[PDB]
Amino acid sequence: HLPLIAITRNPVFPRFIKIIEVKNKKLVELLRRKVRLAQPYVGVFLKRDDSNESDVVESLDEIYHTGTFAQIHEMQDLGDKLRMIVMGHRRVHISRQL
């Protein structure tokens, strides 16, 4: 029960290290709320055709049903304020993502 992450033109092939640098600054709020938790983690999904930032937050069927949970490595934030590292570790097909 977390908002979907904004891939923003970044394909994350299974078992393929990837970096995500969204231009929006609202996902960092979610990144700071997870720091006090014992185990740090993030989930990974892929976006469908006709990318739209308003559709990622408005409806939840746009995203495909497959998903890939994985563990966070380390934050850097060299240039932007949202420099998360992503990985394709555990593929999953959630019964219902909504």
């Binding site: 923003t8 033109r9 970044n10 394909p11 640098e21 231009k23 055709d49």
Partner: protein
């Protein structure tokens, strides 16, 4: 004077494998700026194809084609082209056309310099031969 923004820019809906030629354009630009450094290479690191910050691909292709040293006429010729792969083909052609000359000049410089080295190095050997013959090949003294 009358003017209108008739900037045609058709592109296929499926935009996954269409940026691979762009990948080859930036690879040729990386090879042109690495083997023939013109400008700093930090700008290529600032504007990458993996950042998804290329909101205007036509502009990115033009900026990449701008490093080419081809005459202005060629630039006009690239603008005359309407299809997108034709201009990409021409931009790559401009890059390779410059690249051959660059490679010729670089090979020639290293080759000519090595010829100078083989010149003077053989002279160093001849100098050692003389010095060793003018010293070791004596009984008491030359004078």
């Amino acid at each position: 004077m009358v003017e209108v923004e008739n900037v045609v820019h058709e592109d296929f809906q499926v935009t996954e494998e269409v940026k691979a030629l762009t990948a080859e354009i930036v690879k040729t630009i990386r090879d042109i700026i690495a083997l023939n450094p013109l400008y700093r290479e930090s700008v290529l690191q600032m504007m990458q194809a993996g950042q998804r910050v290329v909101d205007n691909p036509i502009y990115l292709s033009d900026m990449g084609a701008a490093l080419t040293g081809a005459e202005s006429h060629e630039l006009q010729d690239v603008l005359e082209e309407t299809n997108i792969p034709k201009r990409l083909y021409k931009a790559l052609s401009l890059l390779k056309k410059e690249f051959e000359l660059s490679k010729l000049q670089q090979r020639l410089g290293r080759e000519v310099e090595e010829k100078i080295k083989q010149t003077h190095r053989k002279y160093l050997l001849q100098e050692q031969l003389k010095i060793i013959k003018k010293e070791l090949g004596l009984e008491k003294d030359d004078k």
